[PDB]
Design an enzyme around this catalytic site. Sequence first.
Site, PDB file in Angstrom:
ATOM      1  N   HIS A  61      41.432  48.530  51.429  1.00 55.72           N
ATOM      2  CA  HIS A  61      41.410  47.080  51.204  1.00 55.72           C
ATOM      3  C   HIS A  61      42.808  46.533  50.934  1.00 55.72           C
ATOM      4  O   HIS A  61      43.103  45.371  51.239  1.00 55.72           O
ATOM      5  CB  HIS A  61      40.496  46.715  50.029  1.00 55.72           C
ATOM      6  N   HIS A  91      49.313  45.423  43.075  1.00 44.11           N
ATOM      7  CA  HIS A  91      48.960  45.477  44.481  1.00 44.11           C
ATOM      8  C   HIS A  91      49.309  44.136  45.109  1.00 44.11           C
ATOM      9  O   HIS A  91      49.758  43.218  44.417  1.00 44.11           O
ATOM     10  CB  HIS A  91      47.463  45.759  44.656  1.00 44.11           C
ATOM     11  N   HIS A  93      48.271  41.082  48.379  1.00 39.14           N
ATOM     12  CA  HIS A  93      47.460  40.506  49.438  1.00 39.14           C
ATOM     13  C   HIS A  93      48.431  39.829  50.381  1.00 39.14           C
ATOM     14  O   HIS A  93      49.384  39.176  49.930  1.00 39.14           O
ATOM     15  CB  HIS A  93      46.515  39.448  48.867  1.00 39.14           C
ATOM     16  N   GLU A 103      46.423  34.291  47.862  1.00 40.14           N
ATOM     17  CA  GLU A 103      45.086  33.962  47.417  1.00 40.14           C
ATOM     18  C   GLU A 103      45.080  32.609  46.711  1.00 40.14           C
ATOM     19  O   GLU A 103      44.383  31.679  47.128  1.00 40.14           O
ATOM     20  CB  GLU A 103      44.573  35.080  46.513  1.00 40.14           C
ATOM     21  N   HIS A 116      49.992  41.037  42.573  1.00 46.83           N
ATOM     22  CA  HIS A 116      49.168  40.987  41.385  1.00 46.83           C
ATOM     23  C   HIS A 116      49.475  42.178  40.516  1.00 46.83           C
ATOM     24  O   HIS A 116      49.287  43.327  40.930  1.00 46.83           O
ATOM     25  CB  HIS A 116      47.680  40.985  41.754  1.00 46.83           C
ATOM     26  N   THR A 195      39.313  38.903  42.431  1.00 50.66           N
ATOM     27  CA  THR A 195      39.207  38.215  43.727  1.00 50.66           C
ATOM     28  C   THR A 195      38.565  39.086  44.821  1.00 50.66           C
ATOM     29  O   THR A 195      38.519  38.693  45.996  1.00 50.66           O
ATOM     30  CB  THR A 195      40.576  37.734  44.242  1.00 50.66           C
ATOM     31  N   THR A 196      38.119  40.282  44.442  1.00 49.30           N
ATOM     32  CA  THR A 196      37.308  41.130  45.314  1.00 49.30           C
ATOM     33  C   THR A 196      36.037  41.511  44.578  1.00 49.30           C
ATOM     34  O   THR A 196      35.989  41.452  43.348  1.00 49.30           O
ATOM     35  CB  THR A 196      38.010  42.462  45.679  1.00 49.30           C
TER      36      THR A 196
HETATM   37  C1  LIG Z   1      41.748  51.098  42.251  1.00 53.97           C
HETATM   38  C2  LIG Z   1      42.103  49.660  41.929  1.00 53.97           C
HETATM   39  C3  LIG Z   1      41.604  48.587  42.864  1.00 53.97           C
HETATM   40  O1  LIG Z   1      40.822  48.861  43.803  1.00 53.97           O
HETATM   41  O2  LIG Z   1      42.250  47.476  42.874  1.00 53.97           O
HETATM   42  C4  LIG Z   1      41.880  46.404  43.686  1.00 53.97           C
HETATM   43  C5  LIG Z   1      42.909  45.956  44.768  1.00 53.97           C
HETATM   44  O3  LIG Z   1      43.238  47.013  45.603  1.00 53.97           O
HETATM   45  C6  LIG Z   1      44.238  47.779  45.395  1.00 53.97           C
HETATM   46  O4  LIG Z   1      44.726  47.862  44.237  1.00 53.97           O
HETATM   47  C7  LIG Z   1      44.443  48.899  46.378  1.00 53.97           C
HETATM   48  C8  LIG Z   1      44.136  50.286  45.926  1.00 53.97           C
HETATM   49  C9  LIG Z   1      42.498  44.741  45.437  1.00 53.97           C
HETATM   50  O5  LIG Z   1      41.604  44.871  46.473  1.00 53.97           O
HETATM   51  O6  LIG Z   1      42.429  43.726  44.582  1.00 53.97           O
HETATM   52  C10 LIG Z   1      41.293  43.760  43.772  1.00 53.97           C
HETATM   53  C11 LIG Z   1      41.040  42.561  42.885  1.00 53.97           C
HETATM   54  O7  LIG Z   1      42.003  42.492  41.859  1.00 53.97           O
HETATM   55  S1  LIG Z   1      42.581  41.141  41.603  1.00 53.97           S
HETATM   56  N1  LIG Z   1      42.933  40.486  42.978  1.00 53.97           N
HETATM   57  O8  LIG Z   1      41.518  40.319  41.039  1.00 53.97           O
HETATM   58  O9  LIG Z   1      43.736  41.321  40.717  1.00 53.97           O
HETATM   59  C12 LIG Z   1      41.277  45.094  42.816  1.00 53.97           C
HETATM   60  O10 LIG Z   1      40.094  45.343  42.107  1.00 53.97           O
HETATM   61  C13 LIG Z   1      40.120  45.710  40.875  1.00 53.97           C
HETATM   62  O11 LIG Z   1      41.214  45.870  40.293  1.00 53.97           O
HETATM   63  C14 LIG Z   1      38.825  46.017  40.172  1.00 53.97           C
HETATM   64  C15 LIG Z   1      37.910  47.001  40.844  1.00 53.97           C
HETATM   65 ZN   LIG Z   2      44.710  41.059  43.829  1.00 49.29          ZN
END
Ligand SMILES: CCC(=O)O[C@@H]1[C@@H](OC(=O)CC)[C@@H](O)O[C@H](COS(N)(=O)=O)[C@H]1OC(=O)CC
Ligand SMILES: [Zn+2]
EC number: 4.2.1.1
Length: 257
Positions: A61, A91, A93, A103, A116, A195-196
């Site tokens: 993702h 991470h 977007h 976002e 973020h 946001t996911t």
């Molecule tokens: C292993 C950590 C994780 O999957 O992080 C998620 C992140 O992806 C990445 O960090 C890539 C590995 C991403 O999709 O954003 C969402 C949404 O995060 S955000 N955008 O609200 O700051 C996160 O979701 C979460 O942190 C909670 C499950």
């Molecule tokens: Zn994010």
Amino acid sequence: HWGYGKHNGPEHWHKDFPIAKGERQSPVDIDTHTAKYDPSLKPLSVSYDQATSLRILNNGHAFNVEFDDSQDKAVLKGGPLDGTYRLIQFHFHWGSLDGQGSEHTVDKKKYAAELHLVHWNTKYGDFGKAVQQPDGLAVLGIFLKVGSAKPGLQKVVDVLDSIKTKGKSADFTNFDPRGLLPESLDYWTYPGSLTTPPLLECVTWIVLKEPISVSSEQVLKFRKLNFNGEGEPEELMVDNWRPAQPLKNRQIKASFK
Ligand SMILES: CCC(=O)O[C@@H]1[C@@H](OC(=O)CC)[C@@H](O)O[C@H](COS(N)(=O)=O)[C@H]1OC(=O)CC
Ligand SMILES: [Zn+2]
């Protein structure tokens, strides 16, 4: 499951995750002429001196750089925040074109990407417990625009070749997240959500006013990553952003006039 394509994207998430239509969803458009300056807000404190990066991971993702969060080594305090929030990962977007990818938006303006830095409230003991609380997380968001290269981002760019596909990770120690911050910590803040999926409503958003600039070459390398796993047909990892959601019964506060 969920993703960013036509048949599994943000328009579809509410079926598995009804909170997608909830009371405090993120991201939102930041209307700069509606946000209220709040002189009671304390100064924002970013304390990353002892930050310990571990690893970088493509999860299909996005990609994240992970941190040792077993102690208060890298924390965010102050601003709208009560107590101490520990950095767990950062991470991004981003878009398929320089005109989209963020976002949050600012007066409807989309940026090329958004960074973020995710922190959890230490009063809840671990990240999993924190996401079940209305003040469990603080996410610091930083817009990226395309311009001059960002030296502090290059080490991240350099390693993307090694984590091209879903599930790949690589060692990523001794990285300093301070190199990703703009000069000013002026910000807007509001209560929101992840946001996911699972879209949990546990986030205090702190979004910086000043974007950082990154080079076209740097963002192009983000766009060579893959949503798919190794040995599968290629789906470029691009446009992994959720669009702005209704503000509803919320107020955005500004740290500045
Ligand atoms: C292993 C950590 C994780 O999957 O992080 C998620 C992140 O992806 C990445 O960090 C890539 C590995 C991403 O999709 O954003 C969402 C949404 O995060 S955000 N955008 O609200 O700051 C996160 O979701 C979460 O942190 C909670 C499950
Ligand atoms: Zn994010």
